[PDB]
């Protein structure tokens, strides 16, 4: 996915952020991150769906192999990095590198298990969910290395029947869920230095876990492999 490094606009302006993929088959989600150490917020998912708590100045569209986030009447509080997410024929969740919006002229997911680990060790993260019918929604894990963007770790269907993994962890990761205890778990074996970062629990909107349909995010838990 290709999105611009940065865009600029003055308050009240209409700003657009594009995200281009390898075909016209898949859709787009847009995830606002106000600082590198903060949980993302979904502003648009499945091309043009807007969560009810997101201001109506956010809208989305898709044309051919490109998705576009439009903020009509941008405000200072919208200054953030916006990540686009999608999928392709090989991977259920892929992400662009993030677009920094500069403004000129100025459901609970609870992760634990982070910590320090040696290379070759194994990580066990747990996300405790509340405030919704957990067993009805696909769930997943997204990570972010220091100074880098969002990356797919693992996703699992509502009933646990299907799972998939990001390329960098495939063969080492296992995702599971307990629909009685309303929790999803990540096991990551043979840890490498490149596995350190913040790991976020995330919820699918209900349409089926993809990089473009995430509608809720946890607070993150930090993993350091050294």
Author numbering: 2 to 107, 125 to 244
Publication passage describing the model:
The protein tyrosine phosphatase PTP1B, which is a negative regulator of insulin and leptin signaling, is a highly validated target for therapeutic intervention in diabetes and obesity. Previously, we used phage display technology to generate a library of conformation-sensor antibodies that recognize epitopes unique to the reversibly oxidized form of PTP1B (PTP1B-OX), which are not displayed in the active, reduced form of the enzyme. We characterized these conformation-sensor antibodies, such as scFv45, which stabilized the reversibly oxidized, inactive form of PTP1B. For example, scFv45 did not bind to the reduced form of PTP1B, nor did it recognize TCPTP (either in the reduced or oxidized form), which displays ~75% sequence identity to PTP1B in its catalytic domain.
To provide further insights into the molecular details of the interaction between scFv45 and the reversibly oxidized form of PTP1B, we determined the crystal structure of scFv45 at 1.6 Å resolution. This single-chain variable fragment (scFv) antibody contains only the variable light (VL) and variable heavy (VH) chains of the antigen-binding fragment (Fab) connected by an 18 amino acid linker. The structure consists of the VH and VL chains, with no electron density observed for the linker region, in accordance with other reported scFv X-ray crystal structures. Within scFv45, acidic residues dominate the hypervariable complementarity-determining region. Attempts to produce crystals of a purified complex of scFv45 and PTP1B-OX were unsuccessful. Therefore, we performed an in silico docking approach using Cluspro software with Antibody Mode option, with svFv45 as a receptor and PTP1B-OX as a ligand to generate a low-energy structure of the complex. From the model it was clear that acidic residues dominated the complementarity-determining region (CDR) of scFv45; Asp89 and Asp93 of scFv45 formed hydrogen-bonding interactions with basic residues Arg47 and Lys41 of PTP1B-OX, respectively. By mapping the regional boundaries of the binding interface that were determined by our structural proteomic approach onto this model, we noted strong corroboration between the individual datasets. The acidic residues of scFv45 in the CDR region, which are critical for interaction with PTP1B-OX, were found to be lacking in scFv20, suggesting a molecular explanation for the lack of interaction observed between PTP1B-OX and scFv20. Our analysis demonstrates that a cluster of basic residues unique to PTP1B over TCPTP were required for interaction with acidic residues in the complementarity-determining regions of those scFv constructs that bound to the oxidized form of the phosphatase.
